[PDB]
Amino acid sequence: PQAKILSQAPTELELQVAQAFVELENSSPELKAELRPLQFKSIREIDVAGGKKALAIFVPVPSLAGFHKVQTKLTRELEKKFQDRHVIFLAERRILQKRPRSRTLTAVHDKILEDLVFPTEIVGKRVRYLVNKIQKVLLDSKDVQQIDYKLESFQAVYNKLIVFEIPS
Amino acid sequence: GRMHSAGKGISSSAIPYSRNAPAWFKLSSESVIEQIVKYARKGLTPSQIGVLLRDAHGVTQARVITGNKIMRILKSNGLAPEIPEDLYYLIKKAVSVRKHLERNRKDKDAKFRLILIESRIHRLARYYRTVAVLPPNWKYESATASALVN
Amino acid sequence: TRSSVLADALNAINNAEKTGKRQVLIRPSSKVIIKFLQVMQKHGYIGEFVYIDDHRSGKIVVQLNGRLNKCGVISPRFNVKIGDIEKWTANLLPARQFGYVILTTSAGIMDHEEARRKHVSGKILGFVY
Amino acid sequence: VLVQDLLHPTAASEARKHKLKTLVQGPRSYFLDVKCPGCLNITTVFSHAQTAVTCESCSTILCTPTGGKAKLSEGTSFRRK
Amino acid sequence: STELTVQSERAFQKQPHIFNNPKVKTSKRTKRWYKNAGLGFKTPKTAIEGSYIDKKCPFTGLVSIRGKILTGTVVSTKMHRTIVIRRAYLHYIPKYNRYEKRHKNVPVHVSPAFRVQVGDIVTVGQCRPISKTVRFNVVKVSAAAGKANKQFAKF
RNA sequence: UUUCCAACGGGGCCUUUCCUUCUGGCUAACCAGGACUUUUACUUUGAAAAAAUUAGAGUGUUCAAAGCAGGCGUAUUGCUCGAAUAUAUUAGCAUGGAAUAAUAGAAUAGGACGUUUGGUUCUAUUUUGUUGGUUUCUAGGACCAUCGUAAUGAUUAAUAGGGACG
RNA sequence: CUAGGGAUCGGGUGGUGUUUUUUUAAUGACCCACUCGGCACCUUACGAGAAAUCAAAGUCUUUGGGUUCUGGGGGGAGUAUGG
């Protein structure tokens, strides 16, 4: 949980899985220049039924623009070392002395709404009332590469702080 | 429901749910921003910019893949227009009507068609004095509604 | 113009129920109308409803069982004291032992008897059955 | 209408019925990524174009603008999506 | 206008009974009596460090603050050392359960310590009667223009 | 009242639900102390609303309309009940309530989290030695040189309008 | 918002779509469908109205989407008077 490629914002669990934190500055010519600047704040494991923990990796905001070009590859490269545990990269957004309007308290987790998955976007909320209780919200897609199979932990991820029935 | 026209109309630009660049367009935001900056230094009105080079270079809009809208673009460049895009071309309509007003004197609908354009320029000058993008000392006038476009 | 979206609500459901539907598509809609209809579902005059969303106003679909005979906005949205809600009962309600005017107030939105229970009285919204 | 939610209708019944009247809004027209007969460079003109495309190699006007959608000069290779 | 060395009137404006000591001349060089206005008012720093006199200033002169305090917006500063505010309110009628827009003009004396503009927001307090119309005196200027000093130099 | 099954309430707290900072009584229960997660419109609880009118105990004025009057033994030299409350919006004065309508912050980031640092207005409860010309470190505000800070500001593009072009 | 329609006209599309002929569906125009604009029609009237009738002269005693101007029995009288 120690070593190298962060700017030293530590948590007590970084290195038991993460050769990407130690030795992908060694197996990369230019992902060397990509992973080495990046930070992440903290790591929470969250139990979903089956002894199945999701790791809420608190990546900051300035590590999403080029990180989208490696999130297609890295979410299964910790599925190559530890299994029946899961990696989900979350970002942190402003709650809105003097406070503005734009990204207030639910628009905080409106960009923590699409960012369970990538890259197929959204189609809209479908919120049920007496079955604001179960809160349907759907997507439309072009492809399926991290939607439609790991979503049944993502159901338990979101609605405490795009609910996961999607007809392709 | 139209003002000043008494008709019904739908001139459509509708937008579906998804916000970000969905499926196929492979450029970064910097590429389309520098494309719009290339377009902006050509020195034309933002209507003429969009109508050509949203249509000839695969640009979707100037807000979805770009992020900064066009009048925000030009004010970060030093080429922000005097009176932005629409009040100018409504003064251009006033130019056309007032130059036809003295081709022939008794074109009586031209007296009626200037009033509607003049009224909409009054509303636009008043709204642009509201949010303080027009300076509130100058007032729109017919003695400046034919020497300010051409 | 839809000066009151809450008015060009249930008038639409008048034109659905009097014309005999089971649903209607309400667009626009607000949290005014959303909590209005949550209050109506809590009373169960109308049945289940769902808010579906766009990146525009939004739509609501209602699945009642008929018991919505008439609703209506009581615009302009008069401001009422505690004793004066009971004036507004006997003007425009069927009988004493049922029927609800509802209210927006600084305690949110609730009918005039929950106003009598939770001991305020605020601005009018409509009458519902 | 009797008993079906309007997430659950016959789907494509209102799909061509003037985009915004549908259950949500979805635009009518389409994108094309096509290449000219003068460069074989992918020149994305919009389907309902309003601009007469000068070629990127030649000066040939490779489309003529019309209402509805525009009228291209022949020699443009099409493919799907 | 008044040209501090403020004695453009026929009679020397001064603080009454305050006595600039002429025999002893030493490191004092400022004998200016000022009072708190009461009620938690920050005194204006012109009044501490000014040469004007204004008998009816609530910070330097022989008036007092009592009873009422009133908000509003300025209008018509074309008098001298006084403004007029106008307060809008909604009269009530129970025939129709409805309201009615009305306004009232209050002619209120203003200090030279504050400097105002037609359209600001004032807070005034009641005083002893000053003239026929005036029973008030300007005591707080909550100008809410919006910082247009260099706002036109915009990105 | 021992009390098994569910139901109506708000609170202590919690699943980013800040519910704050401020420390002597102190080892936040609550009392001084610096800012509120903005100000009006609205409403809720007090207070002011003269007595006489209007509503009502109780009183066999013989019922009453009235009236606030009066009842009881060994009448042995006395005993003893009263003369309520309801009401009266705006305006005015106090506090929450947290919708509605209003007013908009942070488009310069010449701004906040700045727990930061040269420098500016400073400074005497002071300790100075008793009291006043000559001083600092120094308690308590602001910014330029100046960058460290968390999640740094663009609520929509309307089956509402205004442009362009076809 | 609802009926229910075969056409219209102003636009947009082309069916292994039918013929003169650009070459089966080109110029144009068609059967079958589909869209918004203008002009109309007639049905059962759910709703009305006193009634002729009205898809709005509706969703008003189950009375409140927003806003403007008029009427209070007949006359005398749109008369006098004044602006």
Curated annotation (Swiss-Prot), chain A:
Gene Ontology biological-process entries: cytoplasmic translation; ribosomal small subunit biogenesis; ribosome biogenesis; rRNA processing
Main location (coarse class): cytoplasm
Keyword Transferase: no
InterPro entries from the UniProt entry: Ribosomal_eS7 (IPR000554), Ribosomal_eS7_CS (IPR047861)
Record's GO cellular component terms: 90S preribosome; cytosol; cytosolic small ribosomal subunit; nucleolus; nucleoplasm; small-subunit processome
Keyword Ribosomal protein: yes
Protein keywords: Acetylation, Cytoplasm, Isopeptide bond, Nucleus, Ribonucleoprotein, Ribosomal protein, Ribosome biogenesis, rRNA processing, Ubl conjugation
PROSITE patterns linked to this entry: RIBOSOMAL_S7E
Modification after translation (UniProt): N-terminally acetylated by acetyltransferase NatA.
Subcellular localization(s) per the UniProt record: Cytoplasm; Nucleus, Nucleolus
GO molecular function: structural constituent of ribosome
Cross-link Glycyl lysine isopeptide (Lys-Gly) (interchain with G-Cter in ubiquitin) mapped to chain: K80, K81, K111
Miscellaneous comment as given in the Swiss-Prot or TrEMBL entry: Present with 41000 molecules/cell in log phase SD medium. There are 2 genes for eS7 in yeast.
Main function: Component of the ribosome, a large ribonucleoprotein complex responsible for the synthesis of proteins in the cell. The small ribosomal subunit (SSU) binds messenger RNAs (mRNAs) and translates the encoded message by selecting cognate aminoacyl-transfer RNA (tRNA) molecules. The large subunit (LSU) contains the ribosomal catalytic site termed the peptidyl transferase center (PTC), which catalyzes the formation of peptide bonds, thereby polymerizing the amino acids delivered by tRNAs into a polypeptide chain.
Family the UniProt entry places it in: Belongs to the eukaryotic ribosomal protein eS7 family.
Swiss-Prot record, chain B:
Disulfide bonds: none
GO biological process, one term: cytoplasmic translation
Positions where Phosphoserine occurs in the chain: S31
One Pfam family per UniProt: Ribosomal_S15
UniProt crosslink position (Glycyl lysine isopeptide (Lys-Gly) (interchain with G-Cter in ubiquitin)): K38, K42
InterPro entries assigned to the protein according to its UniProt record, in alphabetical order: Ribosomal_uS15, Ribosomal_uS15_arc_euk, Ribosomal_uS15_N, uS15_NS1_RNA-bd_sf
Source species, domain of life: Eukaryota
GO annotations of cellular component type: 90S preribosome; cytoplasm; cytosol; cytosolic small ribosomal subunit; nucleolus
CDD domains (UniProt xref): Ribosomal_S15p_S13e
Primary role: Component of the ribosome, a large ribonucleoprotein complex responsible for the synthesis of proteins in the cell. The small ribosomal subunit (SSU) binds messenger RNAs (mRNAs) and translates the encoded message by selecting cognate aminoacyl-transfer RNA (tRNA) molecules. The large subunit (LSU) contains the ribosomal catalytic site termed the peptidyl transferase center (PTC), which catalyzes the formation of peptide bonds, thereby polymerizing the amino acids delivered by tRNAs into a polypeptide chain.
Assigned protein family: Belongs to the universal ribosomal protein uS15 family.
Record protein name field: Small ribosomal subunit protein uS15
Species name: Saccharomyces cerevisiae (strain ATCC 204508 / S288c)
Gene name of the encoded protein: RPS13
Swiss-Prot record, chain C:
One GO MF term attached to the UniProt entry: structural constituent of ribosome
Subcellular location(s) per record: Cytoplasm
Pfam families documented for this protein: Ribosomal_S8
UniProt feature coiled coil, ranges: none
Entry's Gene Ontology BP terms: cytoplasmic translation
Annotated Gene Ontology cellular component terms: cytosol; cytosolic small ribosomal subunit
Keyword Ribonucleoprotein: yes
PROSITE patterns assigned to the protein according to its UniProt record, in alphabetical order: RIBOSOMAL_S8
Assembly information from the UniProt record: Component of the small ribosomal subunit (SSU). Mature yeast ribosomes consist of a small (40S) and a large (60S) subunit. The 40S small subunit contains 1 molecule of ribosomal RNA (18S rRNA) and 33 different proteins (encoded by 57 genes). The large 60S subunit contains 3 rRNA molecules (25S, 5.8S and 5S rRNA) and 46 different proteins (encoded by 81 genes).
Misc. remarks from the entry: Present with 40400 molecules/cell in log phase SD medium. There are 2 genes for uS8 in yeast.
Protein name, UniProt field: Small ribosomal subunit protein uS8A
Species: Saccharomyces cerevisiae (strain ATCC 204508 / S288c)
Lineage of producing organism: Eukaryota, Fungi, Dikarya, Ascomycota, Saccharomycotina
Gene: RPS22A
From Swiss-Prot, chain E:
GO BP of this protein: maturation of SSU-rRNA from tricistronic rRNA transcript (SSU-rRNA, 5.8S rRNA, LSU-rRNA); ribosomal small subunit assembly; translation
N-acetylserine PTM positions: S1
Main location group: cytoplasm
Post-translational events: N-terminally acetylated by acetyltransferase NatA.
Gene Ontology MF terms in the entry: rRNA binding; structural constituent of ribosome
Alphabetical keyword list: Acetylation, Cytoplasm, Isopeptide bond, Ribonucleoprotein, Ribosomal protein, RNA-binding, rRNA-binding, Ubl conjugation
Signal peptide: none
Subcellular location, record wording: Cytoplasm
UniProt crosslink position (Glycyl lysine isopeptide (Lys-Gly) (interchain with G-Cter in ubiquitin)): K14, K45, K55, K56, K78, K95, K104, K132, K140, K147
UniProt cross-references to CDD domains, sorted A to Z: Ribosomal_uS17
Entry GO terms, CC: 90S preribosome; cytosol; cytosolic small ribosomal subunit
Additional information: There are 2 genes for uS17 in yeast.
Family: Belongs to the universal ribosomal protein uS17 family.
Biological role: Component of the ribosome, a large ribonucleoprotein complex responsible for the synthesis of proteins in the cell. The small ribosomal subunit (SSU) binds messenger RNAs (mRNAs) and translates the encoded message by selecting cognate aminoacyl-transfer RNA (tRNA) molecules. The large subunit (LSU) contains the ribosomal catalytic site termed the peptidyl transferase center (PTC), which catalyzes the formation of peptide bonds, thereby polymerizing the amino acids delivered by tRNAs into a polypeptide chain.
Descriptive protein name: Small ribosomal subunit protein uS17A
Protein's organism: Saccharomyces cerevisiae (strain ATCC 204508 / S288c)
